[PDB]
Amino acid sequence: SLTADQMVSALLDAEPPILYSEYDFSEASMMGLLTNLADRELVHMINWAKRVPGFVDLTLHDQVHLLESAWLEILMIGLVWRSMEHPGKLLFAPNLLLDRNQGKSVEGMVEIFDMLLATSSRFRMMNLQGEEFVCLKSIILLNSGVYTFTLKSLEEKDHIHRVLDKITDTLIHLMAKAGLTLQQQHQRLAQLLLILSHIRHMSNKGMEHLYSMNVVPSYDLLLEMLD
């Protein structure tokens, strides 16, 4: 029942803070820093999820399943957003800004590194606004695991698509409030959602890369933070 501006305001206030890395740089300790960073970010990510409108209306089981499917996607689009204003670099933390040459120590790391840089350049070429970013991240949370889940499950898939419908209206309204014609509204909406296909592709490579090095957050852990 939230208006478009009420949906934007709720998503902007639910935004998690930018976390930092340990202060006191070696390429040998890089992965320990990034693993520790992602671990701390996940706790704030679950707090943000529980404040995306309509997310806590679902059962905890489906809340867990949605985060199981989208947690790496959400970390990646967050990284890409933080790195948007720093070409050729990924801003994992304000005190942890890495270029492509430092991502060569691990085999297969640079392939995902270049993919993350390309998405960051894509966001840059579009002048993606923060209000559109929080909408795209909310879509990732609800859509990534809605096709891989009884009448209870049918009722909740219907609710997820209802919430996704409001986020779509919110994006359209944001593009209308900004002065875009109708053709530019539908075209930019399509442009944004098509990027989500590549973020999923990046997430699938990240998962594969992490398995070649306790990779996933467990069901009981995701449930413990959610509950």
Place this chain on the structure above:
Amino acid sequence: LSLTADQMVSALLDAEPPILYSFSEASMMGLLTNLADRELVHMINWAKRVPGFVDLTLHDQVHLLESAWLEILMIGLVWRSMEHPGKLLFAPNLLLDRNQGKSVEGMVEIFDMLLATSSRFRMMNLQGEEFVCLKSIILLNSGEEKDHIHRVLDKITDTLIHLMAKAGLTLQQQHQRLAQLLLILSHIRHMSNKGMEHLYSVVPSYDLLLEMLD
């Protein structure tokens, strides 16, 4: 790119590839691998008729096909299997259900993902005009050159909106259904990645795709 929305639909509808034709578990993957191998030629023939595709360089043409070939095979399978609930219609003489995929490690996980996609198509009542547009977007989005690809992608988006507006939908329903269609592409890319992993437990070579394009 100068075509109208109605001319865009007609071009894609006539470019649709034909339905190819194809008992033990070991012979099952034999038939599936053989079927996909024969379908790739007709998929490339379909790609050449997607408006704006042949304006790309041959190098970029191949790269787009390398990137999208498994997604296009899957979304065409989901479209064929749409009115066969719980089953996957690989070929008219090759209709498989869930049980026939349990004998292979990691097959039922993907079989279920394809069936969930076909179930999503039924709930939305996807039309053939929308299907050929979703297939065209997969080809151009999966992989001067980037500017032209984005112009054709924006062209297919205009054609989709035109189809929904012609069907009497309000604008709210128009951009809602557009969003629902494009969010399925994320899951299709997911299935393609999971399918690639399962198949490697494959990829058409550059030279092979180039030969098929003349």
